[PDB]
């Protein structure tokens, strides 16, 4: 399998590997856009022939989520890389991900690897830094009570604060400092970036620390997108 849940919130590193190949990813978004180069690492003493990565998304995905790349060298010698260059475009809010195939020819064989791309809504966020007043008359101006969700959680990892606030800095939005009049919360603010639509998204964090448990709330322009942002940044603490 791969490494899809570490690129929530972060957008370098090694995809997948197996006993002949390592997949590497290098990522960078801006607007309702990103390029990620990917890294087809050869770890044999042996070229791989007919070397073919094709980009697979179901058709609900495909209308939210524009791909383009151009045809990737076939012949990778042993002990080499190569790379792919993917451009994307938002088009929508989405929550499935694109599959990545591999098919290639190795040592007379047939060689078949499938594997999800880490291109997550998150991804599109532009970082919103706002004060205290400013936050608050937005978070209540909310109306629609399913843009409102809520997720309370257990702990996986250690409530160690400057973690968590890095790891809401890698998720996209912007963290604000002192908003939340209880210290102990975290609470963030961005925009989520589509062709299409602008959607205004707030984060409210809140720790137990006697249960080792987390609320989460997410209050955005859009219910779908509350929800997919919601359950990504659960995952992470």
């Known amino acids: ?3 899809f849940a570490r690129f929530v919130c972060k957008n370098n590193g090694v995809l997948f590997e197996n006993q002949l190949l390592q997949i590497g990813l290098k990522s960078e978004f801006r607007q309702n856009l990103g390029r990620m180069f990917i890294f087809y690492g050869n770890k044999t003493s042996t070229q791989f022939l007919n070397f073919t990565p094709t980009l697979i998304c179901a058709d609900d995905l495909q209308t939210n989520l524009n791909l383009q790349t151009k045809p990737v060298d076939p012949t990778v010698d042993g002990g080499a890389q190569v790379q792919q260059v ?3 475009e938002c088009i929508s809010d989405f929550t499935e991900a694109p599959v990545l195939n591999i098919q290639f020819r190795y040592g007379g064989t047939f060689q078949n690897v499938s594997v999800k791309l880490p291109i997550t809504l998150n991804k599109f966020f532009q970082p919103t830094e706002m004060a205290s007043q400013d936050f608050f008359q937005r978070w ?3 109306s629609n009570p399913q843009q409102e969700v809520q997720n309370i959680f257990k702990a996986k990892h250690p409530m160690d604060t400057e973690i968590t606030k890095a790891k ?4 996209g939005s912007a963290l604000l400092e002192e908003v939340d009049p209880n210290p102990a919360n975290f609470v963030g603010a961005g925009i989520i970036h589509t062709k299409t639509t602008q959607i205004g998204c707030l984060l409210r964090l809140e720790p ?3 249960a080792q448990m ?3 709330t ?3 322009s859009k219910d779908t997108v509350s929800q997919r942002l919601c359950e990504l940044l ?3 603490f």
């Open 234 to 236: 659960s995952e992470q």
């Open 208 to 210: 137990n620390l006697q």
């Open 86 to 88: 993917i451009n994307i």
């Open 168 to 171: 809401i800095i890698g998720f």
């Open 1 to 3: 399998e791969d490494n």
């Open 214 to 216: 987390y609320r989460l």
């Open 140 to 142: 209540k101006q909310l």
């Open 218 to 220: 997410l209050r955005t």
